[PDB]
Amino acid sequence: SEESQAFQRQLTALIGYDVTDVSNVHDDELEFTRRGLVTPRMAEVASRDPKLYAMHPWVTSKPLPEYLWKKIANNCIFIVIHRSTTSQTIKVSPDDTPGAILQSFFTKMDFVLRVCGRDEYLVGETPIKNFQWVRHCLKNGEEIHVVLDTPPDPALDEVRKEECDRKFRVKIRGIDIPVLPRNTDLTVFVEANIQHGQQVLCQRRTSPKPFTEEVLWNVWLEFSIKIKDLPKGALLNLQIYCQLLYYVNLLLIDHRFLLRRGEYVLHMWQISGFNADKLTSATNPDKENSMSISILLDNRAEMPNQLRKQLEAIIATDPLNPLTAEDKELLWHFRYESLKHPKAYPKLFSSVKWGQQEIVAKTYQLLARREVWDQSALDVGLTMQLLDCNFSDENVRAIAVQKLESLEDDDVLHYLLQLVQAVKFEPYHDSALARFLLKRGLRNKRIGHFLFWFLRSEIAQSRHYQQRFAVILEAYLRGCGTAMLHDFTQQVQVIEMLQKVTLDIKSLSAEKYDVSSQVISQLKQKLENLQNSQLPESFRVPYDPGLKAGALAIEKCKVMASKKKPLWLEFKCADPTALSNETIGIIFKHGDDLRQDMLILQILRIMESIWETESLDLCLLPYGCISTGDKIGMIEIVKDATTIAKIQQSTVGNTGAFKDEVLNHWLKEKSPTEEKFQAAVERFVYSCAGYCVATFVLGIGDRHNDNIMITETGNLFHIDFGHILKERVPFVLTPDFLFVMGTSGKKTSPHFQKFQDICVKAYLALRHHTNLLIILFSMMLMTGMPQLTSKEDIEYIRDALTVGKNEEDAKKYFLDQIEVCRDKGWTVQFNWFLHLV
Numbered sequence: 154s155e156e157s158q159a160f161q162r163q164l165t166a167l168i169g170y171d172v173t174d175v176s177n178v179h180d181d182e183l184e185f186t187r188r189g190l191v192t193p194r195m196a197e198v199a200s201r202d203p204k205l206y207a208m209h210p211w212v213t214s215k216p217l218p219e220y221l222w223k224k225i226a227n228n229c230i231f232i233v234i235h236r237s238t239t240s241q242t243i244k245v246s247p248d249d250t251p252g253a254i255l256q257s258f259f260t261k262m263d264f265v266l267r268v269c270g271r272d273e274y275l276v277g278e279t280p281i282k283n284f285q286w287v288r289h290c291l292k293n294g295e296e297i298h299v300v301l302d303t304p305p306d307p308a309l310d311e312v313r314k315e316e317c318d319r320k321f322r323v324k325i326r327g328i329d330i331p332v333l334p335r336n337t338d339l340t341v342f343v344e345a346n347i348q349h350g351q352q353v354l355c356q357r358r359t360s361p362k363p364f365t366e367e368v369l370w371n372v373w374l375e376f377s378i379k380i381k382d383l384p385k386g387a388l389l390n391l392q393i394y395c396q397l398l399y400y401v402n403l404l405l406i407d408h409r410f411l412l413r414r415g416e417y418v419l420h421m422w423q424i425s426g427f428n429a430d431k432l433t434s435a436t437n438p439d440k441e442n443s444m445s446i447s448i449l450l451d452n453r454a455e456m457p458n459q460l461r462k463q464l465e466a467i468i469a470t471d472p473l474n475p476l477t478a479e480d481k482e483l484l485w486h487f488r489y490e491s492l493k494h495p496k497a498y499p500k501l502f503s504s505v506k507w508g509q510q511e512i513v514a515k516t517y518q519l520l521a522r523r524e525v526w527d528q529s530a531l532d533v534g535l536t537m538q539l540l541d542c543n544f545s546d547e548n549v550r551a552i553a554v555q556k557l558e559s560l561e562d563d564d565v566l567h568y569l570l571q572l573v574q575a576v577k578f579e580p581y582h583d584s585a586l587a588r589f590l591l592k593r594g595l596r597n598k599r600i601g602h603f604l605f606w607f608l609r610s611e612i613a614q615s616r617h618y619q620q621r622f623a624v625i626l627e628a629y630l631r632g633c634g635t636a637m638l639h640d641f642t643q644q645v646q647v648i649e650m651l652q653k654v655t656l657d658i659k660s661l662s663a664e665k666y667d668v669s670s671q672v673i674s675q676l677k678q679k680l681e682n683l684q685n686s687q688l689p690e691s692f693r694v695p696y697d698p699g700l701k702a703g704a705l706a707i708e709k710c711k712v713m714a715s716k717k718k719p720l721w722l723e724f725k726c727a728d729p730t731a732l733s734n735e736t737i738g739i740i741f742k743h744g745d746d747l748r749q750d751m752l753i754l755q756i757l758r759i760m761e762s763i764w765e766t767e768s769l770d771l772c773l774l775p776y777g778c779i780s781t782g783d784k785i786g787m788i789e790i791v792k793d794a795t796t797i798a799k800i801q802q803s804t805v806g807n808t809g810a811f812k813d814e815v816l817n818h819w820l821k822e823k824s825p826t827e828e829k830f831q832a833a834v835e836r837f838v839y840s841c842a843g844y845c846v847a848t849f850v851l852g853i854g855d856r857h858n859d860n861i862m863i864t865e866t867g868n869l870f871h872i873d874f875g876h877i878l879k880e881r882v883p884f885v886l887t888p889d890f891l892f893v894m895g896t897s898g899k900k901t902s903p904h905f906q907k908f909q910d911i912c913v914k915a916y917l918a919l920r921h922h923t924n925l926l927i928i929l930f931s932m933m934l935m936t937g938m939p940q941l942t943s944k945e946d947i948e949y950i951r952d953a954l955t956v957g958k959n960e961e962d963a964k965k966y967f968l969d970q971i972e973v974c975r976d977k978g979w980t981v982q983f984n985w986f987l988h989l990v
């Protein structure tokens with residue numbers, strides 16, 4: 154139908170890529186997947202409670218922490234219910250369900266409890282203590298304000314219903330580049346590799362022929378591998394060395410479990426400055442400039458003491474610890490003892506010779522047991538381990554996705570970005586994970602909204618992965634409901650408008666520190682033009698979907714004084730039932746790859762949760778950040794917060810003569826009462842402690858004081874992770890923060906002891922989750938950090954988390970790092986001034 158011809162055009166402008174376009178495919182995988190995702194989509198769309206879906210309640214089954222129980226020592230929670238002008242508080246029990254509170258209001262002289270200023274609803278059979286918004290207010294000191302109004306109409310959420318034994322051979326015909334002049338002429342060869350998860354089964358090279366705009370070889374390359382022994386997921390990697398220049402991959406076994414046959418003219422990817430993009434089945438879509446390759450395909454006793462100890466020692470080691478042939482052969486001979494240990498699964502599966510039909514068959518016999526694994530307690534770090542680059546077998550990856558299914562939505566939101574990025578390591582487009590991300594995305598609207606923006610960030614930036622993600626985004630968009638589709642349409646239109654403004658203002662400026670009347674007057678009218686008839690009355694905040702934003706506070710909107718020129722935007726809340734007059738502030742910044750900030754902030758949310766398990770609150774501010782396109786995106790504005798450099802440049806001014814007192818003076822200056830300075834010193838102890846631990850672990854500690862911020866309420870925090878991703882420091886700890894602690898160079902004050910206590914308590918709390926942190930880090934680098942990728946680049950986390958060593962040797966190592974910051978004082982800080990200024 155014609156209505157389906159415009160619907161698809163809506164999906165295309167939403168996705169930012171055309172899913173129907175067959176100009177850059179050599180097979181029907183993407184279309185077959187588009188057709189294959191209709192089943193799991195409808196298996197959720199036509200399976201979800203329309204009432205709870207429309208209301209999207211945010212709940213958690215996790216225990217309320219020791220610190221959050223300290224806020225309610227009276228066993229009573231106060232909730233303020235509002236209708237119009239009337240507002241009366243209720244003495245509610247922590248275990249009281251929304252319905253129990255609904256009747257406790259009717260009795261105290263059809264409707265649903267909606268949050269004030271937020272598109273959030275406190276509904277469903279859950280106690281009020283087990284709500285994320287309630288736990289937020291209890292952590293910040295806010296009162297739980299709610300509106301009495303009718304439930305959201307599920308009719309708005311309607312979905313538009315749709316619908317042998319011979320050795321492997323490869324003939325390398327030749328290579329053709331239209332234009333090569335950039336470097337001095339040398340020789341060239343092709344390296345055809347048969348791989349199954351970063352592991353080469355065999356390698357065959359061509360003879361070196363001279364580098365020309367067309368190099369013909371016509372050589373048949375016979376491999377050591379037989380056609381029967383080729384595993385599903387086997388990826389023929391074609392490489393070019395002058396020393397690597399061009400890579401390309403072809404899935405020897407296809408999506409229908411068929412060996413690839415025929416003539417293929419593959420457009421290859423170049424190298425600029427191991428890597429997730431290096432594994433792509435997708436060809437280069439820019440056929441005019443790219444190098445192509447022409448190829449042709451026509452084809453029961455138990456263990457002794459010391460061995461059990463040897464095996465147990467192997468399972469013990471961190472994910473990064475490599476395995477010798479001895480270790481691998483050990484794991485394999487004692488398969489069944491290794492199967493009895495779930496922590497051995499990532500190591501046992503790396504001991505499989507996948508280029509052996511017989512060994513794979515034995516591996517599949519082991520997977521049939523699964524009893525130990527299926528009954529084992531879910532380990533996210535072990536589940537993620539089996540979903541990485543080192544695992545290409547579908548049935549191996551399925552057991553990880555099987556173990557994932559148990560997660561509550563809250564934990565799905567916790568690991569979403571890392572799971573979204575893990576799709577990059579999948580051999581085929583349609584996968585158990587891709588189907589899992591889709592199911593969960595349609596079951597809840599919060600996962601849905603964030604799944605949309607995560608897929609979109611990569612679609613409008615990655616040529617290597619735009620096509621596959623696009624197929625998964627369409628699948629979601631084709632079942633999210635008319636309302637969400639309407640919402641994303643607004644959001645995108647607004648982001649597109651505001652990115653236009655950002656670049657225009659970036660162009661209308663020269664690198665130097667200026668802020669000339671011309672740029673300020675232009676910015677004023679630029680926004681004024683879009684305010685009147687371009688941007689709608691209300692758009693949803695992508696980083697915080699609870700919040701709806703209205704009109705711009707033009708008089709509050711600015712542009713940075715320095716080289717990057719990002720816009721500082723401010724918006725009024727679209728909700729007239731809001732608790733305050735607090736604006737919605739956004740930063741739009743071009744130059745820095747905000748995908749790197751996203752990953753660091755998502756790990757920061759993880760660390761916070763890990764700390765919660767050992768009842769620690771490190772006052773971290775993982776502010777919202779979404780990458781929208783190439784070297785551009787949004788940043789959430791943390792209210793009434795200033796850079797550390799600005800607090801130093803106020804009393805002093807553009808000098809390295811950093812006076813330690815200025816910081817505490819600012820804290821007492823911005824405090825209305827003495828109690829408000831006491832709460833500010835408390836917030837500073839945790840916030841400084843958390844960010845010291847968090848940064849050192851992630852090896853992003855040595856930072857310039859301009860890239861560290863602080864609030865009027867004492868909460869200190871790190872910023873701009875994109876630009877960072879000799880004399881050195883492990884992290885940031887200078888005498889200015891130390892003065893607030895109460896130390897005059899050499900002192901062990903009551904607040905610096907508190908910091909020293911917390912820091913080791915937090916570092917060890919993260920050591921109880923070593924294998925998880927190591928995986929998330931290893932994955933973060935492979936999927937988000939191009940320059941930060943090699944064996945030695947990933948191996949940083951081991952030394953930082955002090956792998957192998959005891960709690961005593963760990964306690965020592967971290968406090969020694971605090972001392973490195975104390976020995977240096979301001980030496981690396983002044984060095985920043987020589988490079989920056």
Ligand SMILES: Cc1cc([C@@H](C)Nc2ccccc2C(=O)O)c2nc(N3CCOCC3)cc(=O)n2c1
Binds near residue numbers: 713714720790
């Ligand atoms: C490079 C740069 C710069 C800034 C800010 C501090 N600087 C500005 C950004 C935009 C407009 C004006 C300024 C200003 O320098 O006053 C900045 N602010 C961030 N925010 C984190 C959340 O709290 C609000 C701040 C985050 C970030 O990555 N930033 C990066």
